[PDB]
Amino acid sequence: MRGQIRGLEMASKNSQDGISLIQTAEGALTETHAILQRVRELVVQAGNTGT
Amino acid sequence: MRGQIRGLEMASKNSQDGISLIQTAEGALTETHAILQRVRELVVQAGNTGT
């Protein structure tokens, strides 16, 4: 039991650490995405306003 | 009778001595076990927290 208990404590630890990794990459990709919104703004402008 | 009596006195002695040996090894194995609990904690952490 205690072997598993302690393993579950370190499991919770490892999973929370998983979450930390996730949210790191998550926020980074959110910012990336926001850039890409700006990019498409610049694409539509980089329709040259036509000519 | 007295031969057996005296032999029972030394028998009790020998058995108590048995117990002393037992409880020595017992407590030692209890501590060993406690270590092994810590080990498994370090195994679950030595899941590398994954990567």
Side-chain angles (χ1 to χ4, degrees), chain A residues 3-25:
Chain A
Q4 292 180 355
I5 297 169
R6 295 179 183 273
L8 293 173
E9 295 176 353
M10 296 297 101
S12 179
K13 185 176 179 181
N14 290 318
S15 65
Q16 291 178 359
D17 300 330
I19 294 168
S20 297
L21 189 152
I22 292 168
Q23 65 185 0
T24 302

Side-chain angles (χ1 to χ4, degrees), chain B residues 17-33:
Chain B
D17 300 330
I19 294 168
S20 297
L21 189 152
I22 292 168
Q23 65 185 0
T24 302
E26 177 191 340
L29 294 173
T30 302
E31 183 63 23
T32 302
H33 179 73

